[model samples]
Target: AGWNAYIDNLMADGTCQDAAIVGYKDSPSVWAAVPGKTFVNITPAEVGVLVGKDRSSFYVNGLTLGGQKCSVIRDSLLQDGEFSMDLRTKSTFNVTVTKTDKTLVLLTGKEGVHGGLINKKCYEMASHLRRSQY
Candidate 1:
């Protein structure tokens, strides 16, 4: 199948500047969500990196941010096995997780918060999975 190719593409992207350091098994596979699909498969890699331990909110491009969208990404990463997230260049951005038929809408005015480490390739792989499964 195209699974190998899919994973390679995901890891090819730039490493996230800020990421979580969860103490999970070295290799565990799980499913995550994306737009226009149900779910996709993924395996966690050693993308963990250190960040300031003072902020309770998630950071993007060095800016602290927290919201429904951020929570979803965080929960999905730690719980739902999401791999990484990517942020679009904008004041606010949107993303979808394991929730069926759902899409996150960014509302808070957190400018320059353009970085995601757990939702990018996992979601991108969703589209690729659909395409390859055919």
Candidate 2:
């Protein structure tokens, strides 16, 4: 329920300003970023589904290896951020992201769900803007 609810909450919260959805395996499948803002949603991609705010926070939601549900809200400013929640089956869902590397790591201590995600939205936007130097 939190997957879309979280999205709605962020949209309603106003502070987010801009939002983008980055996949766990590749570039953003959908980008709804606001114009003229180089927000954190433009950062490198990460695992599961991520909603990056105005370079201030992040909201992540996805399923576990066993199909259990999990979601979290994290600060984008921290060098390394982590959030842990208990799944319905007593399993622990742990999420972490390192800002310096723009790396996202997800873990289900009981299921070994380790998804590695790296964001590349900024690069894609750069290319579209004809600013790709890479």
Return the top candidate by TM-score. 1
Q: Model 1: runs farther than 4 Å from truth?
A: 16-120
Worst 10 residues of 2 by lDDT: 80-89
State each model's CA lDDT, in order. Answer: 0.30, 0.29
- Over 1-134, each residue of candidate 2 has an lDDT whose tens digit, in order, gives 42233234324533333333223334533223233432233333433323333332323334232233344433343322222222211234233322223222222221333222111322222223222211
Clashing pairs in 2: 44-119, 44-120, 45-118, 45-119, 45-120
Which segments of model 2 are wrong by more than 4 Å? 1-51, 54-68, 73-92, 97-102, 111-134
Clash number for every model? 9, 5
Model 2 alpha-carbon miss at residue 21, Å = 17
Against the hidden true structure, what lDDT does model 2 obtain? Answer: 0.29
Q: How high is each candidate's TM-score? A: 0.27, 0.24
